[PDB]
């Protein structure tokens, strides 16, 4: 997954 946040 790419993720959902900018950091962490």
């Amino acid at each position: 997954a790419v993720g959902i946040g900018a950091v962490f």
Partner: antibody
Amino acid sequence: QVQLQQSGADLVRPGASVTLSCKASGYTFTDYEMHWMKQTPVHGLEWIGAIVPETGYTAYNQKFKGKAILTADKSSNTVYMQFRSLTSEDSAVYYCSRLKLLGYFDVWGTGTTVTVSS
Amino acid sequence: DVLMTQTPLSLPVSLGDQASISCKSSQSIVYKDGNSYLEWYLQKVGQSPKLLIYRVSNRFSGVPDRFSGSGSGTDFTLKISRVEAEDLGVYYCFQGTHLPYTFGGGTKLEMKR
């Protein structure tokens, strides 16, 4: 010893509101986001949404926006998912999983079976 | 959202033989600059899913080299040569670029013996 310990299986009345917990241990909590999956024997696996705890920033599948509410306790290294009005379609096994940016679901929780029944 | 299509949804294979699972994404799942975040997981009855592949062709740490992921554009394939009883379960493919993330219907690997 990365560990995601989920709460125990439940029976909840239709229209009730239940709270599942996922306690992380063995790594630095605020470095990862917690994503939540739903598994049913007919549908299969579904992504519900995610929370980045260090910040508290959530994002939800439109199927589950409104019903599932993700929060995060940074002290106890815990992530909560709330179901606000349970339906017969909410009976499932719910999973938490950790993720860092551009990563993958490497560590999974043990799953919380929710049965909605009268 | 993007629909992931696994085929077959149940796959019988003789012991020691080869097996291939086809997973097709309805849209492109290439991330703006880096590869499509196409991951393969395996689940056994009564266990959490386990990660095998990420970034279509990267084996995860500890996974036997008998598992190989491939594909481009929207066409993806998992290949298990020399299948052992330890490889039983439901294999799910999964996209992790476009929200909401989605899984395929799963594919049940079953031994002939």
